[PDB]
Design a protein around this ligand. Structure first.
Ligand SMILES: *[C@@H]1O[C@H](CO)[C@@H](O[C@@H]2O[C@H](CO)[C@@H](O)[C@H](O)[C@H]2NC(C)=O)[C@H](O)[C@H]1NC(C)=O
Ligand SMILES: *[C@@H]1O[C@H](CO)[C@@H](O)[C@H](O)[C@H]1NC(C)=O
Ligand SMILES: *[C@H]1O[C@H](CO)[C@@H](O)[C@H](O)[C@H]1NC(C)=O
Length: 544
């Protein structure tokens, strides 16, 4: 029997019973962003839900193939040699998929315990993806393991995943988009999905007054931008859109302006790869981009990734959230430090070796001059003095680079461990500490995951790896990532009924941090590489 829910008082949608979980997949929350609506803010859904058979995932939004990155990594270090088969199988499974990709992709999915009734008021967990090596948008993140575990725990939740536009489709900047007021469209997509949840989740048995948003990599960077959206106003028609958050390996971005990697403006490069004439006026280039087929814009996006992000650099360094004076009113770091953020409790953490999967971009660097040149490209407006100070704080000494704590092993090149440490701390660890020290009036918890230490040559406990334990095979540290986060969605404290180590909250006095291992966890403090990370937190002259 198909489970049902009724929206707008009388429109009945049906889902699919999958074991003991009811699923409703492919629910539209905005009108399709096609033709004249390409690159514009999401428009209200003007259709009908009546008779919708929400029985399969919608198309994924336009994105790059993970194969680009996985093949470069494989060329650089031989993934089948370094990653144990039990983790490698899952990792490649999340990088492929049966869903198509299409610009018509603004849909969400609801997962709940079978037989939940609309009056149940179950806590809601809303997942926002952003995995560097994952294909499929929400289709790669089924909520069944989270829902099944919350039932076993006696703490049932509703899980929701939302699609949003990434890349140039969701974050095309430039003067024409600014003049239209259509900046940061992908962030507005997420916010519209959250409005849909506030208005409609009670019909599925969820509680609109207890919503947790969480995500990983660009999804955690998105959650951090939702916390400072409109200077911390997370209300919609008087109601708070979310009440707690978890950020897995991502935080605010250090930009104070719409900058991107390298010597050229990202808009200009993409327009050029799409075959538009970049000497025409701003409005004419945007009109040209709105006339191209999706395959042409897809090839153009692929060329920007391979040529300008070198197939590996985090996508938000090219097309991503930037200050626009409206949904992001000022630089993200400054909004957190002036208290202009939503006052909700959160968990923020990192994998030990966040930078190792990105370090192969600088594989040809053997000397400090070579590393300086790569850093001058990625951070093109950085002052030379600021770069020189980073290079003195992160030396080429093999034992202090990343994979961390591995001595003289894993030195793929003379500079690989150094570049992996710099990218780790600049892009992931410093953003986490900017939030933890700025948000002193909310409860917060932080973690370091070291569970693959010494099991994966050259990569260590790398960026994006923990997603296989949350969404694919529930082995290794899966119980920590499932149960602490279910407890947090229910009680805004990770320690209720987990049967796991007590995780003490982070305080400014003790800087308490959970360290997650393969089978056990231990408490530690967030005390490592203080000088190096602190400099990234405070040197504004690095960023552009
Ligand atoms: C490492 O590779 C990069 C990318 O090919 C080289 O940098 C380029 O060098 C040419 C000539 O100086 C410039 O026109 C490019 O614009 C540079 N691009 C970047 C991203 O820096 C770099 O010279 C190589 N380093 C070594 C030691 O060979
Ligand atoms: C460009 O488009 C904007 C927003 O649609 C409009 O207000 C402006 O007049 C246009 N300007 C030119 C020079 O075409
Ligand atoms: C939709 O139909 C099912 C019967 O399969 C029923 O249990 C459910 O209550 C209906 N939905 C609502 C919200 O009435």
């Amino acid at each position: 029997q198909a489970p049902t829910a009724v929206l707008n008082g009388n429109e009945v949608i049906s889902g699919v019973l999958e074991g003991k979980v009811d699923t409703f997949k492919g629910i539209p929350f905005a009108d399709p962003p096609l033709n004249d609506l390409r690159f514009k803010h999401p428009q209200p859904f003007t259709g009908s839900y009546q008779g919708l058979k929400a029985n399969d995932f919608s198309p994924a939004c336009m994105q790059l193939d993970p194969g680009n990155s996985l093949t470069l990594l494989d060329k650089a270090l031989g993934l089948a040699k370094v990653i144990p088969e039990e983790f490698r199988g899952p990792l490649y499974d999340m990088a492929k998929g049966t869903v198509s990709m299409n610009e018509d992709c603004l849909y969400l999915n609801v997962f709940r315990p079978a037989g939940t009734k609309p009056d149940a008021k179950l806590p809601v967990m809303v997942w926002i993806y952003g995995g560097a090596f994952v294909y499929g948008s929400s289709a790669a993140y089924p909520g069944n393991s989270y829902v099944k575990e919350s039932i076993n725990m006696g703490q049932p939740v509703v899980f929701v995943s939302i699609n949003y536009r990434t890349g140039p489709f969701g974050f095309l900047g430039g003067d024409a988009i600014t003049a239209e007021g259509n900046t940061n469209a992908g962030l507005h997509d997420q916010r519209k999905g959250l409005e849909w949840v506030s208005d409609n989740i009670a019909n599925f048995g969820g509680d609109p007054d207890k919503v947790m948003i969480f995500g990983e990599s660009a999804g955690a960077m998105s959650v951090a931008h939702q916390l400072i959206a409109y200077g911390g106003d997370n209300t919609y028609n008087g109601k708070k859109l979310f009440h707690s958050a978890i950020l897995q390996s991502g935080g605010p971005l250090p930009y104070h302006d719409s900058s991107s990697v390298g010597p050229d403006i990202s808009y200009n490069r993409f327009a050029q790869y799409a075959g538009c004439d970049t000497s025409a006026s701003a409005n004419d280039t945007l009109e040209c981009l709105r006339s191209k087929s999706s395959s042409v814009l897809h090839d153009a996006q692929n060329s920007y990734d391979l040529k300008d992000l070198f197939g590996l650099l985090p996508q938000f360094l090219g097309f991503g959230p930037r200050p626009d004076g409206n949904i992001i009113p000022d630089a993200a770091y400054e909004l957190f430090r002036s208290g202009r953020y939503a006052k909700v409790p959160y968990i923020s953490g990192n994998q030990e070796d966040e930078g190792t999967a990105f370090a192969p971009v600088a594989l040809n660097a053997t000397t400090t001059p070579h590393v300086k040149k790569w850093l001058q490209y990625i951070f093109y407006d950085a002052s030379e003095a600021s770069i020189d100070r980073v290079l003195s704080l992160y030396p080429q000494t093999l034992s202090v680079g990343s994979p961390f704590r591995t001595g003289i092993l894993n030195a793929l090149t003379p500079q690989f461990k150094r570049v992996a440490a710099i990218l780790s701390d600049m892009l992931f660890q410093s953003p986490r500490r900017v939030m933890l020290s700025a948000t002193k009036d909310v409860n917060r918890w932080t973690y370091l995951s070291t569970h693959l230490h010494n099991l994966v040559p050259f990569l260590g406990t790398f960026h994006g790896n923990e997603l296989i334990f949350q969404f694919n095979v529930n082995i290794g540290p899966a119980n920590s990532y499932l149960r602490y986060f279910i407890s947090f969605a229910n009680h805004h404290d990770p320690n209720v009924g987990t049967n796991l180590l007590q995780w003490d909250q982070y305080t400014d006095e003790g800087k308490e941090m959970l360290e997650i291992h393969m089978t056990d966890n231990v408490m530690r403090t967030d005390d490592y590489r203080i000088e190096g990370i602190s400099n990234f937190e405070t040197d504004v002259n690095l960023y552009g």
